[PDB]
Design a protein around this ligand. Structure first.
Ligand SMILES: [Zn+2]
Length: 195
């Protein structure tokens, strides 16, 4: 095809994205925002309507004043390695905060791309009003919820199954074909949300 949808979507992301104060990888930051521009303008416009910002980081999480209490708190599975939220690869909630180079697979998380996955935790719980609670989805989540692995993440919150399957549905065609083959009803659910 062409780049027209991506050019509009990267310009819509400009309106809600926040970069570091200096000393960061500008090609990988802009490539993260391009990988998120490749998703859908309807959800990008809806997060812009909801003023939900994209915080790109290259430093301590505790250097943002909204995470100043988040120094010694220990997240699930990091007690055994002695680690805290201050060094997290990225997170989501009232805002999504994302660490350049650490949102890559295998940097202290098992997700295939944590950028798109934490962004999808925002699309789900802002734009779709947490559709992951809904019993029609839940029948499929109980059927197919772990056929793409990552089971000590996809077994903790329902946004994890949605966002990992959504990342397999957006990131690359080998992951499209793997999700279609492993979670077939889930691809038929996701196409009906996406259309
Ligand atoms: Zn997650």
């Amino acid at each position: 095809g062409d780049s027209t949808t991506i050019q509009q979507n990267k310009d819509t992301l400009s309106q809600i994205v926040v970069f570091p104060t200096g000393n960061y990888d500008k090609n990988e930051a802009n490539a993260m925002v391009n990988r998120l521009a490749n998703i859908d303008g309807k959800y990008l416009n809806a997060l812009k309507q909801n003023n939900l910002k994209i915080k790109l980081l290259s430093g301590k999480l505790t250097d943002e004043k909204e995470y100043a209490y988040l120094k010694g708190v220990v997240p699930k599975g990091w007690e055994g390695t002695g680690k805290t939220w201050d060094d997290v690869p990225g997170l989501g909630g009232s805002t999504v905060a994302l660490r350049i180079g650490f949102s890559n697979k295998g940097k202290g998380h098992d997700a295939i791309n944590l950028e798109l996955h934490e962004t999808a935790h925002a699309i789900d719980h802002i734009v779709l009003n947490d559709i992951s609670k809904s019993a029609q989805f839940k029948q499929i989540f109980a059927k197919e919820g772990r056929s793409l692995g990552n089971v000590n993440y996809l077994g903790v919150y329902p946004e994890e199954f949605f966002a990992e399957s959504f990342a397999y549905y957006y990131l690359n065609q080998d992951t499209n074909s793997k999700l279609k083959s492993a979670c077939p009803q889930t691809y038929s659910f996701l196409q009906n949300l996406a259309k």
